[PDB]
């Protein structure tokens, strides 16, 4: 049922000049600079503003439209820069020998040096977002199509902004509407995902397939018919894919094999572009569309048929788990934080899956041999995933403090987890120590043995071997699967598992990735860093409400600095403080993942092939022997590969040199916040305030040092920005020079 209240909130600027109107605590106005920071920190903490779940839900729904508007403006900007300020068309004509660029700088204070020589007569910043490859796969062949997409984006942005306003101020849904989770799932599965995938199949078959087939055969872009020509003149299509002569009769009569020319199961890669076959991508999306449209008929809405989510959950209980999933349905229909926690965990995990899948099965034409794009996309999507996972921990902890009740959770799975939190955390503590010693300890062994002139005592491929035999065995299964356990597939899902060296131009797109001792060792580092990040976040959640040290922790809240210097000292016991610490470990963990990727690809995958067939890798296979000591990482990775960024001054890569130094600065500045405390700073401010009072220039809003918690927040935010931007600059300067 549609349930709404009309004309709820007037539209005027009255409250815009009343900062902190939304909070009882903040509405009174500042006495102190602390108020200014609190205003920003509390702006989107909607459940701290009101107790009404209906009011909270309405703000959220409307804020979501706001986010979508922002995303459409950003998307529109990308298309517009493509149309107006790029070498897209030139690249379209000669994609092997032109670098993509869609940002051009104005000539002020000498910055026009940044307009690099990217080819096609063009000068601009070389982009690594993969937009050109995306647009090629979509069948876009001219700037007019980009312009029109940009305009459509501005229209969508305005429509989202209207809907946000409308659904808050004019027609706000009632709580009962939001709690229709069965209806929401049916629509998001069948409607959003199902019809989305079906719609995209439609584009693929009717636009992408023909245009890309003509491009790959070597037809000049300007000589290719416009998309609508393929729709109106079926003969144009049937020339390329003969099954179009038979029309839609095979579909309705279940003679689907007739369409096996444009719906394929090839595997491998297009040899011309080094990307997945678009006929496979078309079939993928059709299959996905069918499964999703069926999936979205599972739940009961307005008719007798379907499942109750509550009934499913309530049935799943066994002899080890008490009341089982009883009470979870109530949690997940009354707590936005509980929903956010799950959804961040999955969205983050998915981003990480996307990183891996896109490098190994490159879905776009000319992606694989655009090394800057491959490196950028993997790295970007790994970071987004990491941040989302830490967010899941934050919102799981906020739920435990604010939304958990004992009465709702009597002897269910949630209750039973917290009743053995000591067993969980103690074991995770142990597994982290075990992993730490038997992963990082092996590198230290190796450093020591090599320094002592005992290479024969090292863990290495040529001494004491640690072969990843299980991974090696899986690689073999995947390489022999085509025509066996996958009989109707022609080639491997990925050449990373084994098989041919695919090359485009004379650049290697993808080839088998051998796994040896160096690969075994770095995989156990990843296991280690992920387990520790989990430890910190899990501990935050399970001890959010109380511990042996602080029995009433929940009353202190989610975000508080400590409970004083007693009981030995209680700094950083809060759930928030576990997120703080978890961010550093996520940073540590993902830094090593992207370093592993960068080095392994350059050493063992990327490079040139001769006509004879002699592979020349970017770092010449040094990974196996260098990546088994810390000295090898310091010297052969950091020191060696930093040569590009560090020698960039006076060239078009000079921006990266500047960002590299700037990012080192922001990182170091973070340490001022992390290592100090506000007692020092508040005292310093007292002397400075004395000088202002003396000269009759002291503010009425009294200066305060940052709160204890804000000090920590500022510290970790500068640590991450500095740390991540350093690697960004390092990576881009390097890969743009050699790739």
């Amino acid at each position: 049922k549609v349930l709404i209240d009309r004309n709820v909130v007037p539209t005027n600027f009255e409250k815009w000049s009343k900062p902190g109107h939304f909070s009882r605590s903040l509405a009174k106005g500042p006495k102190t600079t602390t108020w200014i920071w609190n205003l920003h920190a509390d702006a989107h903490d909607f459940d701290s503003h009101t107790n009404s779940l209906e009011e909270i839900s309405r703000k959220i729904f409307s804020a979501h439209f706001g986010q979508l508007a922002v995303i459409f403006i950003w998307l529109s900007g990308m298309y517009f820069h493509g149309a107006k300020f790029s070498n897209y068309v030139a690249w379209l004509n000669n994609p092997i020998n032109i670098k993509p660029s869609a940002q051009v700088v104005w000539p002020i204070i000498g910055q026009e040096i940044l307009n690099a020589d990217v080819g096609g007569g063009f000068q601009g910043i070389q982009i690594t977002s993969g937009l050109f490859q995306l647009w090629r796969a979509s069948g876009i062949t001219n700037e007019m199509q980009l312009y029109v997409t940009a305009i459509g984006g501005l229209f969508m942005a305005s429509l989202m902004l209207f809907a946000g306003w409308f659904h808050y101020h004019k027609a706000a849904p009632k709580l009962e509407w939001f709690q229709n989770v069965e209806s929401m799932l049916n629509h998001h599965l069948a409607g959003l995902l199902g019809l989305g995938s079906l719609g995209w199949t439609g584009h693929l078959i009717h636009v992408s397939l023909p245009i890309n087939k003509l491009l790959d055969s070597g037809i000049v872009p300007a000589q290719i018919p416009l998309p609508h020509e393929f729709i109106l003149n079926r003969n144009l299509m049937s020339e390329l894919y003969p099954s179009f002569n038979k029309g839609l009769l095979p579909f309705f009569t279940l003679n689907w094999n007739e369409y096996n020319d444009f719906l394929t199961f090839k595997g491998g890669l297009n040899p011309v572009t080094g990307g997945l076959w678009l006929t496979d991508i078309a079939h993928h999306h059709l299959a996905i569309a069918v499964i999703f449209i069926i999936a979205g008929h599972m739940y009961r809405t307005n008719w007798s048929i379907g499942h109750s989510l509550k009934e499913i959950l309530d049935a799943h209980k066994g002899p080890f788990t008490g009341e089982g999933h009883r009470g979870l349905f109530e949690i997940l229909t009354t707590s936005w934080h509980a929903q956010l926690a799950i959804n961040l965990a999955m969205l983050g995990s998915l981003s990480i899956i996307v990183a891996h899948h896109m490098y190994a099965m490159p879905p776009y034409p000319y992606l694989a041999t655009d090394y800057p794009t491959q490196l950028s996309l993997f790295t970007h999507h790994m970071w987004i995933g990491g941040f989302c996972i830490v967010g899941a921990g934050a919102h799981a902890a906020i739920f435990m403090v604010r939304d958990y009740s004992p009465a709702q959770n009597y002897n269910n799975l949630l209750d039973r987890v917290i009743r053995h939190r000591d067993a969980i955390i103690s074991h995770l503590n142990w597994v982290c120590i075990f992993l730490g010693f038997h992963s990082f300890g092996l590198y230290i062994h190796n450093d020591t043995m090599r320094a002592l002139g005992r290479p024969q005592d090292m863990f290495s491929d040529v001494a004491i071997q640690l072969q990843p035999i299980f991974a090696q065995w899986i690689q073999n299964c995947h390489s022999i699967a085509p025509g066996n356990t996958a009989p109707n597939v022609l080639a491997t899902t990925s050449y990373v598992f084994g098989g041919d060296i695919i090359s485009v131009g004379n650049k290697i797109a993808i080839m088998p990735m051998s796994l040896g001792t160096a690969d075994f060792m770095v995989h156990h580092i990843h296991a280690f860093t992920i387990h520790v990040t989990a430890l910190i976040l899990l501990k935050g959640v399970l001890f959010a409400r109380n511990s042996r040290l602080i029995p009433d922790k929940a009353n202190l809240g989610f975000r508080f600095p400590c409970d004083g210097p007693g009981r030995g000292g209680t700094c950083q016991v809060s759930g928030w403080d576990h997120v703080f610490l978890g961010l550093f470990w996520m940073y540590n963990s993902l830094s090593i993942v992207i370093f592993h990727f960068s080095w392994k690809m350059q050493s063992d995958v990327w490079g040139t092939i001769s006509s004879s067939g002699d592979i020349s890798h970017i770092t010449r296979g040094n990974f196996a022997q260098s990546a088994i000591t810390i000295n090898g990482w310091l010297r052969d990775f950091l020191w060696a590969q930093a040569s590009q960024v560090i020698q960039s001054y006076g060239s078009s890569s000079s921006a990266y040199g500047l960002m590299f130094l700037g990012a080192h600065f922001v990182w170091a500045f973070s340490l001022m916040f992390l290592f100090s405390g506000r007692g020092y700073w508040q005292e310093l401010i007292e002397s400075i305030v004395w000088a202002h009072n003396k000269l009759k220039v002291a503010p009425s809003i009294q200066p305060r040092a940052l709160s204890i918690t804000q000090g920590r927040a500022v510290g970790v935010a500068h640590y991450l920005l500095g740390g991540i931007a350093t690697t960004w600059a390092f990576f881009l300067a390097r890969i743009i020079a050699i790739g």
Binding site: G110, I113, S654, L658, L684, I688
Partner: protein, 52 residues
């Protein structure tokens, strides 16, 4: 006053270094701010350094 002198030195010393980095990075070392240490050179001359 110690706070003032520290801020004064900090803002301007870091500032000049960053001016110099940006202008050298964009390929114009001739735009650098380069102050001769003439007071120290004068003290060297007072002890008999002829160079200056």
């Amino acid at each position: 006053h110690l706070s003032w002198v520290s801020l004064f030195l900090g803002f301007h010393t870091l500032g000049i270094y960053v001016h110099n980095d940006v202008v050298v990075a964009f390929g114009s070392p001739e735009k650098q701010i380069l102050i001769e240490p003439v007071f120290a050179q004068w003290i060297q001359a007072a002890s008999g350094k002829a160079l200056y």
